[PDB]
Amino acid sequence: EKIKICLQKQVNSSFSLHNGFGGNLYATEEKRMFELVKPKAGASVLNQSTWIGFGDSRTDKSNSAFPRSADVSAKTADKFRFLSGGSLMLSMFGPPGKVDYLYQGCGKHKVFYEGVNWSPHAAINCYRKNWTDIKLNFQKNIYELASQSHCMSLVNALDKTIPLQVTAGTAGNCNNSFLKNPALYTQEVKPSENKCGKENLAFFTLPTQFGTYECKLHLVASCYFIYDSKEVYNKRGCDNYFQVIYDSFGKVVGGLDNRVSPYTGNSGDTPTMQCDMLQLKPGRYSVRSSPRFLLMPERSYCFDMKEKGPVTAVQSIWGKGRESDYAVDQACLSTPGCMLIQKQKPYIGEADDHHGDQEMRELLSGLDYEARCISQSGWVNETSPFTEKYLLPPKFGRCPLAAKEESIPKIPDGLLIPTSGTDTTVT
Amino acid sequence: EKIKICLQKQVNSSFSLHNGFGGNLYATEEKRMFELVKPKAGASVLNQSTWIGFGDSRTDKSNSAFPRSADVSAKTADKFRFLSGGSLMLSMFGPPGKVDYLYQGCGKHKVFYEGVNWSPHAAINCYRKNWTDIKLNFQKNIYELASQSHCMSLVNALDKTIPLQVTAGTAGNCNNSFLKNPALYTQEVKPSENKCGKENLAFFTLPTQFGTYECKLHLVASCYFIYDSKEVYNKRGCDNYFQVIYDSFGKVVGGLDNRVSPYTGNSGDTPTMQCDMLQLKPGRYSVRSSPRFLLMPERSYCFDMKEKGPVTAVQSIWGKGRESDYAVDQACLSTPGCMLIQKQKPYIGEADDHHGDQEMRELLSGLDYEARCISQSGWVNETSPFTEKYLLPPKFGRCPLAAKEESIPKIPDGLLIPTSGTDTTVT
Amino acid sequence: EKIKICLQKQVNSSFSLHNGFGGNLYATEEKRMFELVKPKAGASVLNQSTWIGFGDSRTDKSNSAFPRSADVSAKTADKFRFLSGGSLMLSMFGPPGKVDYLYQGCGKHKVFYEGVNWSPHAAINCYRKNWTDIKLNFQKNIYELASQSHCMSLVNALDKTIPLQVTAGTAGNCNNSFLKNPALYTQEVKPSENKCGKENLAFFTLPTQFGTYECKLHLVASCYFIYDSKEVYNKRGCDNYFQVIYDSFGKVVGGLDNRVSPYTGNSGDTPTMQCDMLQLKPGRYSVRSSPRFLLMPERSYCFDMKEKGPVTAVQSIWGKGRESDYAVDQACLSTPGCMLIQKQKPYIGEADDHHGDQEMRELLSGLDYEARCISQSGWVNETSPFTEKYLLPPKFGRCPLAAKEESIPKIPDGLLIPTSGTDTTVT
Amino acid sequence: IDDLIIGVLFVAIVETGIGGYLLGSRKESGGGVTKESAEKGFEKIGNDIQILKSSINIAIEKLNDRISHDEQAIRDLTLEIENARSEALLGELGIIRALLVGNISIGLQESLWELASEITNRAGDLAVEVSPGCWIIDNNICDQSCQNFIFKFNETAPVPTI
Amino acid sequence: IDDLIIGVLFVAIVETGIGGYLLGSRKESGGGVTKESAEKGFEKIGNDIQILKSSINIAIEKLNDRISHDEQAIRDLTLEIENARSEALLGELGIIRALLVGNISIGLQESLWELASEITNRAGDLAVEVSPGCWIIDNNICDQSCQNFIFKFNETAPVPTI
Amino acid sequence: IDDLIIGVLFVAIVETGIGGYLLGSRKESGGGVTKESAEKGFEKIGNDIQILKSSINIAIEKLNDRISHDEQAIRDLTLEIENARSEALLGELGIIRALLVGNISIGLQESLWELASEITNRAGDLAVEVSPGCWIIDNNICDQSCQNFIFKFNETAPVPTI
Ligand SMILES: *[C@@H]1O[C@H](CO)[C@@H](O[C@@H]2O[C@H](CO)[C@@H](O[C@@H]3O[C@H](CO)[C@@H](O)[C@H](O)[C@@H]3O)[C@H](O)[C@H]2NC(C)=O)[C@H](O)[C@H]1NC(C)=O
Ligand SMILES: *[C@@H]1O[C@H](CO)[C@@H](O[C@@H]2O[C@H](CO)[C@@H](O[C@@H]3O[C@H](CO)[C@@H](O)[C@H](O)[C@@H]3O)[C@H](O)[C@H]2NC(C)=O)[C@H](O)[C@H]1NC(C)=O
Ligand SMILES: *[C@@H]1O[C@H](CO)[C@@H](O[C@@H]2O[C@H](CO)[C@@H](O[C@@H]3O[C@H](CO)[C@@H](O)[C@H](O)[C@@H]3O)[C@H](O)[C@H]2NC(C)=O)[C@H](O)[C@H]1NC(C)=O
Ligand SMILES: *[C@@H]1O[C@H](CO)[C@@H](O[C@@H]2O[C@H](CO)[C@@H](O[C@@H]3O[C@H](CO)[C@@H](O)[C@H](O)[C@@H]3O)[C@H](O)[C@H]2NC(C)=O)[C@H](O)[C@H]1NC(C)=O
Ligand SMILES: *[C@@H]1O[C@H](CO)[C@@H](O[C@@H]2O[C@H](CO)[C@@H](O[C@@H]3O[C@H](CO)[C@@H](O)[C@H](O)[C@@H]3O)[C@H](O)[C@H]2NC(C)=O)[C@H](O)[C@H]1NC(C)=O
Ligand SMILES: *[C@@H]1O[C@H](CO)[C@@H](O[C@H]2O[C@H](CO)[C@@H](O[C@@H]3O[C@H](CO)[C@@H](O)[C@H](O)[C@@H]3O)[C@H](O)[C@H]2NC(C)=O)[C@H](O)[C@H]1NC(C)=O
Ligand SMILES: *[C@@H]1O[C@H](CO)[C@@H](O[C@H]2O[C@H](CO)[C@@H](O[C@@H]3O[C@H](CO)[C@@H](O)[C@H](O)[C@@H]3O)[C@H](O)[C@H]2NC(C)=O)[C@H](O)[C@H]1NC(C)=O
């Protein structure tokens, strides 16, 4: 007897009807095509090998109590050029009674924890008590030049020529001497005895190399004393105050000349010092100044200026009890290419109050991983072209784009049954 | 006998061959997929329930001759905060011989018909005849702050402290008194008999709330008298003219000091008044002025500043016979977030010359409908993601995009016949 | 007996498996979908009929030694408005002892080879030996106005009114006369004999048409003499130097007035002339000047200002032995809408050192072909929507976009074999 | 090569004559071509065309109001952006038009395969291998009555086998 | 119109009963319907589904890591740009989803056509014109043994033709 | 599972042997495989491949000169914008390549179904159910002559039925 057999499809219980072009499809379960990625708080790096850091006491591998004292891991710390008590600003200006160090290195991404060692607590008063503006402006320029360089190094000495008429100065508010960057020199000049001195002329040569380091641009500080008035200067000098920086050609590039510009002080018999930040290319420069004062700059930072790249700047502030400034923050936020890392909770250290903060550690934890994107909103090492929402303006790497999970496609899963013609679904 | 039967497809008369991927398709007729939408001239609103208007006499529901007189419908007029003879500028400065009112309200979209009641015709000369610049600058700030606020209110009273030496002023060109915003106060000073006076110090408090209204920013007018010269002021004073507004801390935020700034007038023995527009935060402020003149501000506009939102400004000009300025137009066209509505035919009213214009009615007709987009090129409540050409820059809602009809896809209509494989079309 | 026959497909030797939707495809060979287009060096034009050129000696068809001497073809040269020894600047200011001509024409694209005939070599010293700055600024304005105009013409004469007191001048450093654009006139004034003069007032009328040429904007030179001091002027004139240009209403639009402005010279007893470039609309203008000097402008360039359009500017420099400046280059590079054509090899002419350069010929060859895009990177007449990399910012026509050949799709070629469903590929 | 009556895959240009869906019949080695309307089968095809048009409507609605709600306060121009977005969206519209035409076409063809199935199902003698959308039947076995039932959907007196 | 057993193109809603792939059989002009699980070619269908899913995986990876490696140092906002790119890429994802569903669907259907072919190949007597994915056999010719071999793949005693 | 000769849907890797389109024949339950070129059927396929290539050409022309005429006078950079447009247009090109390959593939396959129809039409006894793109004929009934006519298009002495 004839029997009819058919291969039948029947759809049961829980099912989704995925719509297409050229047949539709039934499936029992369904799931999302992509999963939204999230940026993780703190700092991390791309490539995990093309980066370099400039450190303090909390990134120092030679710290006796290191694990405790450290705001970073050992792994992370290895890429740093550290020294306990150190600061870029301390090596830049070399104030007496503080540490001094040759900061230098190369890399695509530069990581700074600079600042805390020259905060208001440090109490430098070499004719200037509030360092904050100088610190800020110095940092701003460091960040600027660094996010545009591959290699950088401190320049702790340079070529100079001083005229025999003047000999090295000292100041009681600058411990027992004077700074290692603006070098003070004076000659005998006494207006009352009518023993009037001569203007100074001195030379200096900025080197276009510093060992292996290639110097295409130098960050130097042009400093000078700001006197209140005529009468005040005229106690100690017969003429008028002036300190001016000339180039090789004969053009002036900075300083203060009170033979042609009015006096602007407010510190009485004693003046107050102002240091302007200048960017200078290598060559033979000259300086001129009034008889009683010569302030030759003898230090600078050397930048190769080769390529642009990320810069991370960590908020370098003290533990409890020590007065801190926000120069770091301010400077970063006013220069492009740097990402600021800042603390939401107070700084409370393990080793002592100023070293080994809990928060800072779980932020700088990322520096041991290899990120696929880093942004001012955080870092990510996980893949996926999407994120819940947009990441803050400066960002580097393979960026994820903003999208809603409800708008992501769904993929059929479990039991799948194909529809064909118009015959296909009976009811 | 064996007979062969075939189901044949045959195409006849008018037919179009629509190309595809996976076969083509024949159809007898065809039409466009999307119709190009048009922007309609006039004013309209999104959401039709989150908007508020500030009115005059032509938006006034309490006007006896309303229908005739009205440039709007009854439905539309109800969302307005109106008053016949009203004006924001009239309540802001309160000049004598004019109306006084408390404009206030909240909304995502604010609609202004402000201006006409203080045009050159209105006749105010409280030491200033041409009000146009003041009007303009005032409107500009109103539009600015309003397109950045949810709630706004006039402030017609505040906390003040006036010193016993001065007593309330009056002026013959300001009718029989003086303004209800800059409050004049004077003391005796007579240079001829050497009966010289004392400089004034007076306080005032801008309130952070005004009933329900929240004040995060106040729009105040800092006013002062401009004298021709030393000698001219020195007829009535023994010092020099000055009126200056200080903050709670003690810094100056506005005014004019002729003890240090030269005399700039050109009006002779009588001065001319200048009112600068200032944006002030709530707090306790102070003012200082010359013996003979104290001008304390006693009114302002209070803005909550919560959210950005649309602003429509209608060209508030007079019917034929009364002189009108273009302050409204100018102010809007120079501030972002506002859309200007302006006439292309003269203003000819039904009720009287100045109320109930034909044109204006068919323009402000849209305000009763709920638009899906509103732009400076017009409004639309009709669907479709496309339009013939681009709409002018400020626009709000679901925008239609520019496209040409000749490139819009065509949809088959009438009789449809499918093509299959390569066999499919014989000839 | 029963025999089974099958139509078999078999794939052999070299084959590529092109992946699709609705089956894949085998093919024996494969090639790229689009060939990347290249931007050819030199100058060329779009539409080959809406363009016009302004020429010199190397573009002149009446030159006896043309073929040799020419930096262009005969075909190309026909679209030029040339003249041997010519220059726009020479016709603009008309210096004595130099060629005079009426440059003019219309077109969407204007091509300039202007400049070489008034380079430092040319030796004009009509109170100014270094013409470069004037040349530069003049060229900048010509390019500027030209990339915003359809028609342009030189205006070598205009309507004027001179006062009877002054009579035409001459200058020994300007050969035997003076320029044909600033026209010099003086009256007899002697300070020592107290034969002082009267200030001059003279008029001039800028015409709205010049034949068929429409003048919406005129490029005129406002010139004046710069004297070292009071005393120096007071040798030749009792009062003070001044030359000033007023409008129809009575406002001032240019010049120098040393009755109020200090004397800025550095040329001693003889002054030095400065000509500022002004853009003026048609009307009746007036000028006022000190007794001893009247400098009325009598020439200008007339622009219709109708429409934006491309401008090509060729580096017009000399052969070996005549000093050349880069005014052309500089002027173009500081104006938008122009494309600069410049030489990478020295100028070595066939006819003489200065005419018929090899390089210039292999650059300006493109002007005989019809390009589909022209850019500062070069031109292209070939089709294809892609090119190796982005063309330099100013460019006109059907632009090709940047792409990598390795990412361009490949098209199957040779023998093609279709894949079907799941059954299709056996192994 | 089939003759004057050809399969359902085929569509022939009959510009001045009968168009649409029709029954093309003739005898194998005998009586000439007879062509007559398929409007009794069309009630299915037509109804599926409505279902297809429902799909179309939906897909068009799905492309309406795509772009987000703006609130532009700035007076600066964005035309170069609007242009580049329009050129892209225009490209998208091109693609989805060709895709839709094929999908519609295919689904329409599959509705002609429901007629085959139903007609074949109606009488056992209708099952035979001929040409795509063509069948062969015997006029001794089945008269007008059963033919009229079988493929003209008029349910008149079904075919007798003994 | 087929009765209570219908072809392979078809899919029927049976929410609380048996679902998936099943063998629906009954006597021609007689006895009731028998339905039973197909759990043995489903490894075939299923395995082919894994190959289809392999395609899916690949195509999903091909949409991962598409955007270029940035180094944005400027603090300027690009949200308005990110939005316009996201809206476009979202549209693209829509299209390729519908395309993928169809391509998968089609390739899945073609694996059901591999079963037909194989079952037809298994016994000569299985070749007959019935309904898409339906076949007819005779119980006087083939017993349980060969049936169980033919479409339940038990390889039990193949059909004897003499 | 079919044996040493398999259907038209199939394509087999024969890297160092005969390729293209060929006639694979053997006896049913007897003598071994004979393989030989199909270059007489190919004359159809080949011409249709040209028509298909004509479609390609058109579609390529249709993608040429799509960007509108520029007049950029400003000297500022748009590379980052051009880049984002290129990334999109590149994506679009990917899609339409896969779409084109399938459409071409399909249309090519349908021209192999035109051969089936023609060969089947050539001799009535050639109509039989075997495997997709395979047929069975009897050499008792038809010699070389008619075979050579039937599928090698050489019109030699057609098959007699008595
Ligand atoms: C991407 O970065 C994430 C973190 O953001 C990495 O996840 C972490 O992976 C490590 C191993 O590499 C896991 O560490 C292990 O944790 C367990 C459990 O606590 C412990 O027993 C082990 O000794 C070790 O510490 C860690 O759990 C994991 N983080 C989380 C939240 O699960 C990830 O590995 C990175 N991937 C790549 C490829 O870079
Ligand atoms: C697009 O422009 C190119 C050049 O950029 C054109 O190619 C050139 O076409 C000319 C004729 O118009 C060819 O000239 C001939 O050269 C031969 C070879 O020496 C000579 O014997 C002839 O007397 C003549 O001068 C020239 O060969 C050719 N370029 C190259 C590199 O071979 C092209 O025709 C243009 N196409 C269009 C449609 O505008
Ligand atoms: C292509 O041919 C088809 C035939 O299959 C055309 O359809 C037929 O169009 C005529 C147009 O007049 C319709 O005739 C009208 O019929 C109604 C009754 O339904 C009658 O009241 C009218 O007076 C008239 O006779 C006819 O209905 C229609 N066929 C069907 C099945 O509806 C088709 O219009 C042709 N193409 C073009 C572009 O005309
Ligand atoms: C739609 O119907 C299908 C049947 O064709 C469902 O598949 C069957 O799902 C049940 C779920 O409980 C599975 O049962 C489990 O069997 C294992 C042994 O394999 C046993 O250890 C468990 O205790 C349980 O009874 C069953 O295996 C499965 N069929 C096959 C062939 O695997 C399907 O799940 C239904 N749809 C939905 C949404 O449930
Ligand atoms: C894959 O196999 C096919 C066969 O179906 C190859 O086609 C055959 O290729 C040879 C290549 O030399 C052709 O022979 C040549 O014929 C020409 C005359 O047309 C003659 O001048 C040469 O000396 C040579 O004998 C042969 O004709 C051709 N088959 C057909 C039908 O034309 C195909 O080339 C193979 N794939 C690859 C990548 O080679
Ligand atoms: C549209 O569906 C196609 C299937 O109908 C799909 O192709 C896939 O199937 C083919 C076989 O016909 C695969 O080819 C094999 O792949 C296996 C590994 O999975 C290999 O072992 C074997 O050698 C052979 O290459 C294709 O590889 C497979 N596709 C993928 C991406 O794996 C099409 O890909 C699909 N179209 C799209 C755009 O998804
Ligand atoms: C998907 O493949 C289609 C083919 O299966 C392709 O259409 C092409 O084939 C049709 C015939 O079915 C051509 O129409 C004929 O063209 C010839 C000339 O080549 C004419 O003589 C004749 O009158 C008729 O127009 C189509 O022209 C042809 N396509 C093209 C572009 O030429 C589809 O185009 C293809 N889909 C896509 C989007 O390319």
Author numbering:
A (entry chain C), B (entry chain A), C (entry chain E): 1 to 427
D (entry chain B), E (entry chain D), F (entry chain F): 4 to 165
Lines from the paper:
We picked and averaged subtomograms of the envelope from spherical virus particles with a matrix, revealing the 150 Å long trimeric HEF at 9.2 Å resolution. A comparison between the newly obtained map and the crystal structure of the trimeric ectodomain of HEF reveals a dramatic difference in the overall conformation of the molecule. The map and the X-ray model show good agreement in much of the stem region but the maps diverge in the head region where HEF1 domains are splayed out. We applied flexible fitting of the X-ray model to obtain a model for the in situ structure of HEF. Comparison14 of the in situ model with the X-ray model shows points of flexion in both HEF1 (residues 33–34 and 408–409) and HEF2 (residues 65–69 and 99–100). The HEF1 head region in isolation (residues 41 to 371 of HEF1) behaves as a rigid body and itself does not undergo any significant conformational changes in our fitted model compared to the X-ray structure (1.0 Å2 RMSD). The HEF1 head region rotates 20° clockwise (viewed toward the HEF2 stem) and its center of mass is displaced ~7 Å further away from the three-fold axis toward the peripheral density of the nearest neighboring trimer. In the outward position of HEF1 observed in the in situ structure, the HEF2 interhelical loop remains associated with the HEF1 beta-sheet and no longer interposes between long helices allowing the tops of the central helices to associate along the trimer axis (interhelix distance ~12 Å). In the in situ structure, we identify prominent elongated densities on the surface for carbohydrates at N-linked glycosylation sites N12 and N381 of HEF1 and N106 of HEF2 that further validate the fitted model. The in situ “open” conformation of HEF appears to be stabilized by HEF1-HEF1 interactions and the splaying of the membrane distal regions is required to mediate the contacts.
